[PDB]
Amino acid sequence: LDGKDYRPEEQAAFDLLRDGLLDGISNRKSTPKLDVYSDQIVWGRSPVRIDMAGGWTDTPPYSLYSGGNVVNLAIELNGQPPLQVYVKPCKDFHIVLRSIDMGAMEIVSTFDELQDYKKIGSPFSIPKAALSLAGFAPAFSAVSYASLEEQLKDFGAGIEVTLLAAIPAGSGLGTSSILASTVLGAINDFCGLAWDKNEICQRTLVLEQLLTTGGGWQDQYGGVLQGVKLLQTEAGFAQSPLVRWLPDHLFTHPEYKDCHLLYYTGITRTAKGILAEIVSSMFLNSSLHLNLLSEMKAHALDMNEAIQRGSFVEFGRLVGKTWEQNKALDSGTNPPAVEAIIDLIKDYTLGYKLPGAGGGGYLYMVAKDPQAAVRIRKILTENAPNPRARFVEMTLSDKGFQVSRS
Amino acid sequence: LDGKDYRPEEQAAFDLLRDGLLDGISNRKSTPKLDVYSDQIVWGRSPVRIDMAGGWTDTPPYSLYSGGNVVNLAIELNGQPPLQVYVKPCKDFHIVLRSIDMGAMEIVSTFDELQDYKKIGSPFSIPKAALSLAG
Amino acid sequence: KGILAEIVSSMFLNSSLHLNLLSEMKAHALDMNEAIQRGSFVEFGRLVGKTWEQNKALDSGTNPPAVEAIIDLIKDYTLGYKLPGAGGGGYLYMVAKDPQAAVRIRKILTENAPNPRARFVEMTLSDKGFQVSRS
Amino acid sequence: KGILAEIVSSMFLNSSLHLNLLSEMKAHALDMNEAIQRGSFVEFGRLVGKTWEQNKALDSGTNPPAVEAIIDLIKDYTLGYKLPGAGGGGYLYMVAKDPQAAVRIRKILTENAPNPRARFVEMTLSDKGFQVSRS
């Protein structure tokens, strides 16, 4: 702020931010995973959150510490859930990361460090951290990933792991985070180490630190679990329960006073390079941010009580409120083409939001009832770039985990 | 059967068997496929038959000609259907066949013939023929 | 399968009582569809076991006696079965009365369990089966 | 029920430790909803058996020992239960681990079967519940 070494000031803050989140978890372990066994294929899969309310009450700096609460949902695009991961043993001691919609391959055994790469943002980056199980142990070495695999699996793979996302990371749906978590669930099945959903997400957040994205963290509990989150509570250092539930049930038995909400991209994301800055600029330093943050939390409890009674009409109010509560608030980045899609309609009947990020991606919005379908006719009518302008639903459908079949 | 050139006899029968089935279809065409478009991913999927009855009444030689009948079913293992195929555009003018449970890759643009390979029975062999649109 | 499709294509209308048995496989298929077209589930099961007989004892007698040990027990509880498709490996299915069926699952649960595992797998009729191109 | 609603309305805030126990019934209800609001199904079962205790041993101690013979066996396999609503007749429900539950169905299937029959009846959550005026 004075003048001098902002980049080093950012570096000092960044390293301290990491060190702040470097605390701290069991173990980091040493475990020789075994399970698979050979012939199998382990396939995981996961639905995708949105956050109705309870917005950036996530994302350290929270309140600071403590906590937040988000209550979000965890839902599904038409089929498949998507975000689905395949992982297999092989013959050839080089851990291949293999992607689709981008992926040629990532031939890996070096580690080099491990894995941990914000180095080249081939989202193969995310499976790197998926090898951060610990990902160390006795008494192996760099060549002796030979030992790692070929006593672990033992199953002489150099494991080849093959994800799939359906949607780009310009979703504002936390898809990166969810994806990583799902991989970790597949590992937990895969060759061993026997974990929990929650501690899956714990260790996920732990590596999400070194993933160095701002930890949009609501999602990784959200989209894995089912239609609630709720209660981010402790947030130091950073402690993370947060659980309990809610009926949906007015997202199903369906309303049918519409019987819901659904999608418009016509807009790509910017993507996000200023947003998580304004988050982590700052902590309990500044400003009325901290203020507005606090009643986001309040409005989240508002939310859950509301639909915990079933006030669907007021559910819609609180949705539009959250929209207001971020659009006009932090962060005022929603780019006026979005507002043209808001413009028409705003009308017919009620409110909306951008989930998650904002500044691209896609909304959803609730109406009365079949005037809703006439809104589908409205976006059907105009405002249709080739980022298409759909009904996409959403489709609450959820548990979301894995198979290891057969 | 007499003695002599069973392998050539099998070869003659094999080529005649092919030539018998070489007949014959529209077109083989020329079509410039376009659709995709770019950003998309096309994912296919399929359930798996069994045949309750109506066994090898399939499989030329049938009766010979004609016909058979099988009536079988078309069913599904628990989920996914399985047998599911993803296919995508890219940047890099080499048709990659990519498999899973075996597949490293098959980098292809040669054709060489086309595709058509009973050459190495990497079941990438099957997508070769999948490029036989005509091809 | 390296002998099976040989015995198929050895031969055409050359030989033998194959051609004979082939013909009533077709007949038995029409038998099948009429049967379950009326809903004679019990007789559906008969015709399944018949098809098994109609290929096991018939072309092709390749079903390897470990399969027959899995047949051996049970054969019993209640009714028949087949290997779909190829035979000589892979996996069967079989129909019973009703929950004695689940006790058969307990039977294969009990023994006869190599690491090619010995499951309920279902099957699960569920079907259309095509593609998405989403979105 | 001719004594039960008496003990209810004998009395109001007159007497006794009734009023006491009543109050933590309310407390235990908030216990309940928070419990399954988190999904602690195992603890859901605990609180069910607690409510049973909280009325059986408590107001009202009317549950007639034949009921307790149906409790007797089982109590076991695995977890608790209650009589809904009144008590002193009618019918329970009870939760177990998992298919040991079905073996409990085998247990009540085995014995303890007067002609007020001894069933699985389910229950079956299914609900909105109103009217038609059709058409």
- Say yes or no for a CB contact (<8 Å) between A41 and B100: yes
- Say yes or no for a CB contact (<8 Å) between A245 and D34: no
CA A191 to chain centre: 24
Q: Do chains B and D touch (3 or more CB pairs under 8 A)?
A: no
Beta-bridge partners for C74: none
- All residues at 6 or more sequence positions from A322 whose CB lies less than 8 Å from its CB, including other chains: A52, A53, A54, A55, A296, A299, A303, A353
Q: Which chain B residues are Cβ-neighbours of C3 within 8 angstroms?
A: none
- Cα–Cα dist A345/A343, whole Å: 5
Q: In chain D, what is the greatest distance between 2 CA atoms, to the nearest angstrom? A: 55
- Cα–Cα dist C33/B52, whole Å: 10
A contact set with D (CB within 8 A): 243-246, 253
Q: Is C113 helix (H, G, I), strand (E, B) or coil?
A: coil
Q: Which chain C residues are Cβ-neighbours of B66 within 8 angstroms?
A: none
Task: Using DSSP bridges, classify how beta strands A160-162 and A95-98 pair: parallel, antiparallel or unpaired.
Answer: parallel
- Cα–Cα dist A182/A193, whole Å: 15
- Cα–Cα dist A213/A273, whole Å: 10
The whole-angstrom distance between A91's CA and the closest CA on chain C is 20
Q: Where do runs of H (alpha helix) occur along chain C?
A: 4-9, 17-38, 41-56, 65-72, 100-110
Helix-helix angle A197-211:A175-190, to 10 degrees: 130
Q: How many CB atoms lie within 10 A of CB D112?
A: 14
- Say yes or no for a CB contact (<8 Å) between A245 and D128: no
Q: What b/e readout covers D61-88, taking b as 16+ CB neighbours within 10 angstroms? A: ebbeeebeebbeebeeebbbbbbeeebe
Cβ-in-10-Å burial (0-12, 13-18, 19+) of A273 comes to: exposed
- All residues at 6 or more sequence positions from A15 whose CB lies less than 8 Å from its CB, including other chains: none
Q: How far is CA D7 from CA A176, A367, B52, B97, D62, in A?
A: 61, 52, 67, 79, 11
The whole-angstrom distance between A391's CA and the closest CA on chain C is 10
Alpha-carbon dihedral A331, A333, A334, A335, rounded to 10 degrees: 170
The whole-angstrom distance between A230's CA and the closest CA on chain D is 10
The whole-angstrom distance between A156's CA and the closest CA on chain C is 19
Nearest CA-CA partner of A235 in A28, A390, A57: A57
Hey, CA dihedral for A272, A274, A275, A281, is it positive or negative? positive
Shortest CA distance from B107: residue in chain A: A104
A142 residue type, one letter: A
- Say yes or no for a CB contact (<8 Å) between C119 and A406: yes
Q: Which chain D residues are Cβ-neighbours of A246 within 8 angstroms?
A: 37
Nearest CA-CA partner of A269 in A391, A170, A375, A383: A170
Q: How far is CA A112 from CA A28, A59, A91, A140, in A?
A: 18, 30, 21, 14
Concatenate the DSSP letters of all residues of B88-134 into one string: ---SSSSEEE--SSS-S-EEE-S--SSS---SS--TTHHHHHHH-S-
Q: Are A257 and A349 in contact (CB under 8 A)?
A: no
Q: Which chain B residues are Cβ-neighbours of A43 within 8 angstroms?
A: 80
Token pair 């959150």 in the structure block, residue: A49
Q: Which chain A residues are Cβ-neighbours of C115 within 8 angstroms?
A: 37
The whole-angstrom distance between B101's CA and the closest CA on chain A is 7
Token pair 């997202």 in the structure block, residue: A251
Q: Which of C44, C125, C131 sits opposite B75 (nearest CB)?
A: C125
Beta-bridge partners for A161: A87, A97
Q: Is A379 helix (H, G, I), strand (E, B) or coil?
A: helix
**Residue D82 backbone phi and psi in degrees, to 5:** -170, 165
Q: How many CB atoms lie within 10 A of CB A10?
A: 13
User: What value, to the nearest 5°, has the Cα angle with vertex D130 and ends D129 and D134?
Assistant: 130
Q: Are A216 and A174 in contact (CB under 8 A)?
A: yes
The whole-angstrom distance between A305's CA and the closest CA on chain D is 13
Shortest CA distance from A392: residue in chain C: C135
A134 DSSP assignment: S
- Cα–Cα dist D112/D128, whole Å: 35
Q: Are A128 and A115 in contact (CB under 8 A)?
A: yes
Q: In chain A, what is the greatest distance between 2 CA atoms, to the nearest angstrom? A: 65
Q: How far is CA A276 from CA A59, A120, A213, in A?
A: 8, 20, 8
C contact set with A (CB within 8 A): 115, 117, 119, 121, 134-135
- Cα–Cα dist B6/C38, whole Å: 50
- Say yes or no for a CB contact (<8 Å) between C134 and A406: no
Q: Is A393 helix (H, G, I), strand (E, B) or coil?
A: coil
Helix (H) or strand (E) holding D26: helix D17-38
Q: Which of B55, B73, B74 sits opposite C54 (nearest CB)?
A: B55
Q: How far is CA C36 from CA A320, A405, C26, C46, in A?
A: 57, 32, 16, 11
Cβ-in-10-Å burial (0-12, 13-18, 19+) of C65 comes to: exposed
Terminal CA-to-CA distance of chain C, rounded, Å? 41
Q: Which chain C residues are Cβ-neighbours of B81 within 8 angstroms?
A: 126, 129
Cβ-in-10-Å burial (0-12, 13-18, 19+) of A315 comes to: buried
Helix (H) or strand (E) holding A208: helix A197-211
- Say yes or no for a CB contact (<8 Å) between A245 and D39: yes
* B42: its two tokens: 């096309």
- All residues at 6 or more sequence positions from D61 whose CB lies less than 8 Å from its CB, including other chains: none
Q: Residue C14 half-sphere exposure, CB side, CA atoms within 13 Å?
A: 7
CA A364 to chain centre: 18
Experimental determination approach used? cryo-EM
